[PDB]
Amino acid sequence: NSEVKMPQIDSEWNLELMPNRSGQYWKVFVYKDLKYNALFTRSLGWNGGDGVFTTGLPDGNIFWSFNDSFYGVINENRSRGNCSFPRNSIMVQTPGEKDENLVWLADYVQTNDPNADRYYQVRTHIRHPKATLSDEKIQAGEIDQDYLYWAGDATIYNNQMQMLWGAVDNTDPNNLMRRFGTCLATYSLEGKPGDATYMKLISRNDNFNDHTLGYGDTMWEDEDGHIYLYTTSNYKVAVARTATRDLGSQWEYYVADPQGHFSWTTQYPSTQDAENSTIIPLESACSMPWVFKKGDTYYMIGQSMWFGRDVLMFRSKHPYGPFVDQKTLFTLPEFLDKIGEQRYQHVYMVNIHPALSRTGELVISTNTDCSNFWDNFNAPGSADFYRPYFYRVFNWESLYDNDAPL
């Protein structure tokens, strides 16, 4: 296919084209979204974080969930000051794309005295029942380090958002961040962001799963009435699905027999069996796989293994089917657009945001890390290691131009 679909970029979008790296195809146009990078360059309240998962709502707003995030003050030259580090938090983005539109639904400690301690510091949004810090220590702004919840994907069912929260055990210093269960949280969509009713946790089932595998960390609501729930174990992608569009429906797992024969079973598979049932090639590895459908093709986008900067893409004729023909969509930067040291430790949580897509382009966001935790404070630019950076990929579909069909 000789056609080169030139993308029409509005200057208002504040996109900056990235140079042909090596990893990306010449027909694929990759951009740095400077508008969104600016939206998440904040000084008061949320000013750095992890996770960063969107969910377009039926009222035109977008729901954002975060994992470990800094809530507090950023000083002169993006030098992070006094902050809280809640294990999770949420926000609602309303139409407008100005900071006023990021409605942080935060459990603030205090927002009255800028000269007093705990200014714009926040508490964990949803706490794990096994966490032992006392209600007094939680009121005093202490954050849980033993048992916690981190964001899973979420869907809309009966004008209510059903979300999965993954239970994480950090009591073993060798085996840290051990997934040990899931909680099904139901949120109301009654009112407007800031209301008492809007995005209030209506119900929680903290004993929903006790599963080791994180089925549902990413999701895909398909035309066939099932919500596909994905996970990885040692960079092997396994899939499960809900019986109906209710996230609380009976789950069935796509698991492979010893003869390589796949079939849907209601029994939760062993980790060993879930890894034998990989839905990507056996010669491929990826983490945080995001599946979506465009036309009559299912596309999967994931980060290459061991915190690789290469963003991978696979395709299939089904949301569970053999994901094949790996391609490198693009390579994430080696340096951050930051004050001070631009080099960083890890890039992870390469997430996909259909709700932010203006014309069908992929809207991707990363999470980054610095080796030493103290470097997230008190130095020029320290604020900008631990925050998402946004990208837009136009004409991503081109990757399979000169390949046969499935």
mmCIF file of all heavy atoms in Angstrom, residues 360-381:
data_model
loop_
_atom_site.group_PDB
_atom_site.id
_atom_site.type_symbol
_atom_site.label_atom_id
_atom_site.label_comp_id
_atom_site.label_asym_id
_atom_site.label_seq_id
_atom_site.Cartn_x
_atom_site.Cartn_y
_atom_site.Cartn_z
ATOM 1 N N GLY A 360 -9.273 9.016 16.372
ATOM 2 C CA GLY A 360 -8.958 7.601 16.177
ATOM 3 C C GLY A 360 -7.515 7.240 16.469
ATOM 4 O O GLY A 360 -7.178 6.056 16.491
ATOM 5 N N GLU A 361 -6.648 8.266 16.701
ATOM 6 C CA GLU A 361 -5.236 8.086 17.056
ATOM 7 C C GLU A 361 -5.122 7.343 18.375
ATOM 8 O O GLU A 361 -6.059 7.385 19.170
ATOM 9 C CB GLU A 361 -4.505 9.476 17.152
ATOM 10 C CG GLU A 361 -4.823 10.385 18.354
ATOM 11 C CD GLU A 361 -6.012 11.320 18.225
ATOM 12 O OE1 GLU A 361 -6.952 10.980 17.473
ATOM 13 O OE2 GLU A 361 -6.014 12.387 18.885
ATOM 14 N N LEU A 362 -3.996 6.683 18.634
ATOM 15 C CA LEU A 362 -3.828 6.032 19.935
ATOM 16 C C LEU A 362 -3.364 7.068 20.903
ATOM 17 O O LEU A 362 -2.504 7.846 20.528
ATOM 18 C CB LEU A 362 -2.811 4.890 19.892
ATOM 19 C CG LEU A 362 -3.140 3.751 18.965
ATOM 20 C CD1 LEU A 362 -1.907 2.941 18.666
ATOM 21 C CD2 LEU A 362 -4.216 2.867 19.528
ATOM 22 N N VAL A 363 -3.929 7.121 22.124
ATOM 23 C CA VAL A 363 -3.466 8.056 23.153
ATOM 24 C C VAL A 363 -2.839 7.185 24.227
ATOM 25 O O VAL A 363 -3.540 6.412 24.871
ATOM 26 C CB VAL A 363 -4.560 8.989 23.687
ATOM 27 C CG1 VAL A 363 -3.950 10.068 24.587
ATOM 28 C CG2 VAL A 363 -5.326 9.618 22.538
ATOM 29 N N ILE A 364 -1.508 7.241 24.344
ATOM 30 C CA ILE A 364 -0.719 6.408 25.244
ATOM 31 C C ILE A 364 -0.109 7.262 26.355
ATOM 32 O O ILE A 364 0.204 8.429 26.130
ATOM 33 C CB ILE A 364 0.379 5.681 24.403
ATOM 34 C CG1 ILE A 364 -0.267 4.667 23.429
ATOM 35 C CG2 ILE A 364 1.410 4.979 25.284
ATOM 36 C CD1 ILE A 364 0.546 4.344 22.258
ATOM 37 N N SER A 365 0.065 6.681 27.541
ATOM 38 C CA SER A 365 0.674 7.368 28.676
ATOM 39 C C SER A 365 1.593 6.412 29.392
ATOM 40 O O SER A 365 1.256 5.239 29.526
ATOM 41 C CB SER A 365 -0.390 7.907 29.632
ATOM 42 O OG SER A 365 -0.892 6.926 30.526
ATOM 43 N N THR A 366 2.748 6.899 29.854
ATOM 44 C CA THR A 366 3.712 6.093 30.588
ATOM 45 C C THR A 366 3.681 6.431 32.058
ATOM 46 O O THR A 366 2.933 7.293 32.493
ATOM 47 C CB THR A 366 5.119 6.379 30.069
ATOM 48 O OG1 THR A 366 5.464 7.743 30.341
ATOM 49 C CG2 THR A 366 5.277 6.063 28.618
ATOM 50 N N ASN A 367 4.462 5.693 32.822
ATOM 51 C CA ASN A 367 4.806 5.936 34.211
ATOM 52 C C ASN A 367 6.307 5.817 34.228
ATOM 53 O O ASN A 367 6.818 4.958 33.510
ATOM 54 C CB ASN A 367 4.165 4.920 35.171
ATOM 55 C CG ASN A 367 2.675 4.973 35.405
ATOM 56 O OD1 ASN A 367 2.151 4.111 36.121
ATOM 57 N ND2 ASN A 367 1.933 5.956 34.873
ATOM 58 N N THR A 368 7.027 6.674 34.981
ATOM 59 C CA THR A 368 8.487 6.599 35.061
ATOM 60 C C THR A 368 8.902 6.658 36.502
ATOM 61 O O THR A 368 8.118 7.042 37.359
ATOM 62 C CB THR A 368 9.167 7.638 34.176
ATOM 63 O OG1 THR A 368 8.444 8.863 34.242
ATOM 64 C CG2 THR A 368 9.255 7.170 32.734
ATOM 65 N N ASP A 369 10.140 6.239 36.751
ATOM 66 C CA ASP A 369 10.780 5.997 38.052
ATOM 67 C C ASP A 369 12.192 6.532 38.088
ATOM 68 O O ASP A 369 12.885 6.398 37.079
ATOM 69 C CB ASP A 369 10.950 4.444 38.134
ATOM 70 C CG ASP A 369 10.365 3.668 39.254
ATOM 71 O OD1 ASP A 369 9.371 4.129 39.836
ATOM 72 O OD2 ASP A 369 10.796 2.520 39.448
ATOM 73 N N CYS A 370 12.701 6.943 39.263
ATOM 74 C CA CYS A 370 14.143 7.217 39.429
ATOM 75 C C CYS A 370 14.663 6.155 40.421
ATOM 76 O O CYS A 370 13.872 5.631 41.215
ATOM 77 C CB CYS A 370 14.428 8.645 39.877
ATOM 78 S SG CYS A 370 13.550 9.151 41.360
ATOM 79 N N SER A 371 15.937 5.745 40.297
ATOM 80 C CA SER A 371 16.503 4.660 41.131
ATOM 81 C C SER A 371 16.320 4.901 42.621
ATOM 82 O O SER A 371 15.850 4.015 43.339
ATOM 83 C CB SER A 371 17.987 4.466 40.841
ATOM 84 O OG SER A 371 18.239 4.329 39.449
ATOM 85 N N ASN A 372 16.648 6.113 43.072
ATOM 86 C CA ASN A 372 16.573 6.489 44.475
ATOM 87 C C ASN A 372 15.296 7.284 44.777
ATOM 88 O O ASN A 372 15.023 8.292 44.126
ATOM 89 C CB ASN A 372 17.799 7.274 44.836
ATOM 90 C CG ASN A 372 19.112 6.558 44.504
ATOM 91 O OD1 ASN A 372 19.888 7.015 43.661
ATOM 92 N ND2 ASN A 372 19.372 5.385 45.108
ATOM 93 N N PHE A 373 14.514 6.829 45.766
ATOM 94 C CA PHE A 373 13.224 7.445 46.091
ATOM 95 C C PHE A 373 13.324 8.895 46.541
ATOM 96 O O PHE A 373 12.387 9.660 46.289
ATOM 97 C CB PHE A 373 12.469 6.631 47.174
ATOM 98 C CG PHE A 373 11.022 7.053 47.378
ATOM 99 C CD1 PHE A 373 10.016 6.585 46.542
ATOM 100 C CD2 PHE A 373 10.681 7.969 48.359
ATOM 101 C CE1 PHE A 373 8.694 7.015 46.700
ATOM 102 C CE2 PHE A 373 9.355 8.388 48.527
ATOM 103 C CZ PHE A 373 8.369 7.895 47.711
ATOM 104 N N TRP A 374 14.456 9.281 47.193
ATOM 105 C CA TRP A 374 14.661 10.646 47.684
ATOM 106 C C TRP A 374 14.768 11.658 46.563
ATOM 107 O O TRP A 374 14.497 12.839 46.789
ATOM 108 C CB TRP A 374 15.916 10.751 48.584
ATOM 109 C CG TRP A 374 17.202 10.159 48.054
ATOM 110 C CD1 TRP A 374 18.243 10.831 47.477
ATOM 111 C CD2 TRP A 374 17.641 8.806 48.213
ATOM 112 N NE1 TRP A 374 19.276 9.965 47.211
ATOM 113 C CE2 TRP A 374 18.941 8.719 47.675
ATOM 114 C CE3 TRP A 374 17.051 7.652 48.733
ATOM 115 C CZ2 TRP A 374 19.646 7.514 47.633
ATOM 116 C CZ3 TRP A 374 17.750 6.468 48.683
ATOM 117 C CH2 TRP A 374 19.031 6.408 48.143
ATOM 118 N N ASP A 375 15.118 11.205 45.342
ATOM 119 C CA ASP A 375 15.292 12.095 44.194
ATOM 120 C C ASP A 375 13.932 12.592 43.637
ATOM 121 O O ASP A 375 13.929 13.422 42.727
ATOM 122 C CB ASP A 375 16.163 11.448 43.107
ATOM 123 C CG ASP A 375 17.624 11.321 43.522
ATOM 124 O OD1 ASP A 375 18.104 12.186 44.285
ATOM 125 O OD2 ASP A 375 18.297 10.395 43.042
ATOM 126 N N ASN A 376 12.791 12.148 44.229
ATOM 127 C CA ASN A 376 11.457 12.649 43.937
ATOM 128 C C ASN A 376 11.196 13.936 44.733
ATOM 129 O O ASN A 376 10.106 14.470 44.609
ATOM 130 C CB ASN A 376 10.379 11.587 44.289
ATOM 131 C CG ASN A 376 10.447 10.352 43.424
ATOM 132 O OD1 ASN A 376 10.272 10.410 42.195
ATOM 133 N ND2 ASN A 376 10.703 9.207 44.034
ATOM 134 N N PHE A 377 12.188 14.443 45.555
ATOM 135 C CA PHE A 377 12.034 15.665 46.371
ATOM 136 C C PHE A 377 13.252 16.584 46.392
ATOM 137 O O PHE A 377 14.376 16.164 46.116
ATOM 138 C CB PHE A 377 11.787 15.286 47.846
ATOM 139 C CG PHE A 377 10.741 14.237 48.100
ATOM 140 C CD1 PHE A 377 11.056 12.886 48.014
ATOM 141 C CD2 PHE A 377 9.455 14.595 48.491
ATOM 142 C CE1 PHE A 377 10.094 11.915 48.246
ATOM 143 C CE2 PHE A 377 8.497 13.620 48.747
ATOM 144 C CZ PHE A 377 8.818 12.285 48.596
ATOM 145 N N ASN A 378 13.005 17.833 46.822
ATOM 146 C CA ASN A 378 13.962 18.874 47.179
ATOM 147 C C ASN A 378 15.077 19.263 46.188
ATOM 148 O O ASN A 378 15.994 19.968 46.602
ATOM 149 C CB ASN A 378 14.632 18.475 48.491
ATOM 150 C CG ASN A 378 13.668 18.429 49.656
ATOM 151 O OD1 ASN A 378 12.607 19.066 49.654
ATOM 152 N ND2 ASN A 378 14.001 17.677 50.676
ATOM 153 N N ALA A 379 15.015 18.873 44.935
ATOM 154 C CA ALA A 379 16.018 19.285 43.946
ATOM 155 C C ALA A 379 15.302 19.837 42.770
ATOM 156 O O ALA A 379 14.200 19.362 42.475
ATOM 157 C CB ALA A 379 16.864 18.102 43.514
ATOM 158 N N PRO A 380 15.892 20.772 42.009
ATOM 159 C CA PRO A 380 15.194 21.267 40.812
ATOM 160 C C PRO A 380 14.761 20.132 39.870
ATOM 161 O O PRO A 380 15.551 19.230 39.592
ATOM 162 C CB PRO A 380 16.237 22.170 40.156
ATOM 163 C CG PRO A 380 17.097 22.615 41.274
ATOM 164 C CD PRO A 380 17.191 21.448 42.191
ATOM 165 N N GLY A 381 13.492 20.145 39.453
ATOM 166 C CA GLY A 381 12.958 19.135 38.547
ATOM 167 C C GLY A 381 12.589 17.800 39.148
ATOM 168 O O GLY A 381 11.998 16.973 38.453
#
